[PDB]
């Protein structure tokens, strides 16, 4: 054999049971729903396809509205669980990719098989609905960043600055760099299981690294004891382990390492010579990712390793301030650790043949009929 159309039919009276079982009560780590990443998106789109086929615009509207409202309900109740937020970000994006891929617009059909093009919508242009879904995905992404940030925040200063250096969860209760890496591993494995777009995973990871670098640099500038040659070495080692993690995950082109540039330059600043005019010119050339206020703070805080090393002189600091005078610089000392880089959801068509997709019987959607 039978050649299915790749659509799903349901009765209007069952629409609320549909979103109840497909959205409200769906477990994000359930086996059945994770056999095919994005399965709820594919199911919803196949339901949209049959509503379009029936020439029923009110049914399309009702299904989309119930879908969007149900996803918001889930995230209001469980929005502090990163697995749930990852899951609906991923499925919201996949639903949007489906609506594009099967829109009938030629720009979105370049990777389509001949069979896939047979599955485009025929009666309705759903561009307005794609905008609403895009807006929803932006909101979910913003919630994802906040949940991940909340999880990492308690680990970052201990792991990056305080603690000195198979993995352990902690060192006698203390968060270490290894704690941070385990947490990043968890995040990444869940996003992958959910089928999150690789370009979106890259953006999440870039955002997380930004937060790590911002919180670390700010606490270096706010404490009195973190500006030393030795701490410079420690930060260098920790950054190199974060870089190795990116390598392990094939994310070295995510832009994540580059968000650490202010912290990286602060660590370098701790380790250069700080006496002559050549030393001063080098600092000014080197520290393009640090504000003048930040450079001056580090130099003031800098602690000699022992008696054979001196503090930075006040006249040296003045020389750098003079050199950086015509910098149209921000007067701020602290990085904005709450900055979120604007997210994008580039089109990611899928190879999945709709006419082959089977609903797992355990999801309790037996009232849906395969067309």
């Amino acid at each position: 054999e039978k050649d299915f159309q790749g659509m799903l039919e349901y009765k209007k009276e069952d629409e609320q049971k549909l979103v109840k079982n497909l959205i409200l009560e769906l477990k994000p780590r359930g086996v059945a729903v994770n056999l095919i990443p994005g399965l709820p998106a594919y199911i919803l789109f196949m339901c949209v396809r049959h509503a379009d086929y029936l020439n029923d615009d009110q049914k399309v509207r009702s299904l989309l509205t119930s879908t969007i409202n149900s996803i918001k309900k889930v995230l209001k109740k469980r929005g502090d669980d990163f697995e749930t937020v990852s899951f609906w970000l991923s499925n919201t994006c996949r639903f949007l990719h489906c609506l594009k891929q099967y829109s009938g617009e030629e720009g979105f059909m370049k990777h389509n098989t001949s069979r896939q093009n047979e599955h485009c919508l025929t009666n309705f242009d759903l561009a307005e609905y794609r905008q609403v879904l895009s807006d929803l995905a932006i909101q979910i992404y913003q919630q994802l960043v906040r949940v991940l940030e909340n999880i990492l925040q308690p680990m970052i200063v201990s792991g990056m600055l305080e603690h000195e250096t198979t993995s352990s969860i902690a060192d006698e209760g203390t968060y270490t760099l290894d704690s941070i890496l385990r947490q990043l591993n968890s995040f990444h494995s869940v996003m992958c299981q959910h089928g999150m777009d690789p370009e979106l995973i890259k953006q999440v990871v870039k955002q997380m690294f930004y937060i790590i670098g911002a919180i670390t640099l700010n606490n270096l500038l706010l404490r009195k004891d973190m500006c030393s040659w030795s701490k410079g070495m420690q930060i260098r080692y920790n950054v190199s382990q974060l870089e190795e993690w990116l390598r392990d995950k094939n994310l070295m082109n995510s832009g994540a390492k580059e968000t650490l540039e202010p912290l990286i330059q602060a660590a370098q600043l701790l380790q250069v010579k700080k006496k002559t005019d050549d030393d001063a010119e080098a600092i000014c050339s080197m520290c393009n990712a640090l504000t003048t206020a930040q450079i001056v703070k580090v130099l003031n805080l800098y602690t000699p390793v022992n008696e054979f090393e001196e503090r930075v002189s006040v006249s040296f600091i003045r020389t750098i301030q003079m050199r950086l005078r015509d910098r149209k610089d921000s007067p701020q000392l602290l990085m904005d650790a709450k900055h979120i880089f604007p997210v994008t959801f580039p089109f990611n068509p899928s190879s999945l043949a709709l006419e082959t997709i089977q609903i797992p019987a355990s999801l309790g959607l037996g009232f849906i009929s395969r067309v």
Binding site: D57, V60, R61, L64, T65, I68, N69, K72, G104, L121, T122, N123, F124, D125, L126, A127, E128, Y129, Q131, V132, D135, L136, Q139
Partner: peptide
């Protein structure tokens, strides 16, 4: 066949009821 551009409630509008 022409595809008619449907009017979608905005995300905000849906947030009502």
């Amino acid at each position: 066949r022409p595809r008619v551009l449907l009017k979608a409630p905005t995300l905000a509008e849906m947030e009502e009821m």
